[PDB]
């Protein structure tokens, strides 16, 4: 995902959890040279990262 600059890793977990009614195991957030905080959301083993992918629109 791409996330606003001022956002904890504790805050990104809640947003994705509440947005798509999903579960999150851990989050990793680098900050790209442009200045956007790219976030890697590791998905909980109980869920299938493809089946969530189709819902949110990305292929």
């Amino acid at each position: 995902f791409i996330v606003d600059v001022k956002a904890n890793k504790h805050q990104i977990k809640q947003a994705v959890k509440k947005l798509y009614d999903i579960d999150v195991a851990k989050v990793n957030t680098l900050i790209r040279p442009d200045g956007e905080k790219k976030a890697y959301v590791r998905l909980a083993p109980d869920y299938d990262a493809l089946d969530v992918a189709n819902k949110i629109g990305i292929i």
Partner: protein, 122 residues
């Protein structure tokens, strides 16, 4: 599509939030359509929505402050928002009925030697 501001003025503050969060999901969905292809149909539509959220939010902020500014009228200590903001000076300088006062001595003189018209033949 189009949502006027002339039907939103009266709906409940718990009904607006329903539509306000509806759009924010709709805007969330369109942003994907920009990244992953889409067409010129959805891309132009983001401007239609992004201003709708401006319409709904402002209506909320207005009915929130209009009600509050009715609550604080008739009171004497009201928050710093609801007080007028004229300038730096038109708050500390002027006064309502405090710098329109006349002492007893000044009042009696104007009361006793009033100024009155006249005119003179040449």
């Amino acid at each position: 599509a189009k949502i006027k501001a002339r039907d939103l003025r009266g709906k409940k503050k718990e009904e607006l939030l329903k539509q306000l969060d509806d759009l924010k999901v709709e805007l969330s969905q369109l942003r994907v359509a920009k990244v992953t292809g889409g067409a010129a149909s959805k891309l132009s539509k983001i401007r239609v929505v992004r201003k709708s959220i401006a319409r709904v939010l402002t209506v909320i902020n207005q009915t929130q402050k209009e009600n509050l500014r009715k609550f604080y009228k008739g009171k004497k200590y009201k928050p710093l928002d609801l007080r007028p903001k004229k300038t730096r000076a038109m708050r500390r300088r002027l006064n309502k009925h405090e710098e329109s006062l006349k002492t007893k001595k000044q009042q009696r003189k104007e009361r006793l030697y009033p100024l009155r018209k006249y005119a003179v033949k040449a």
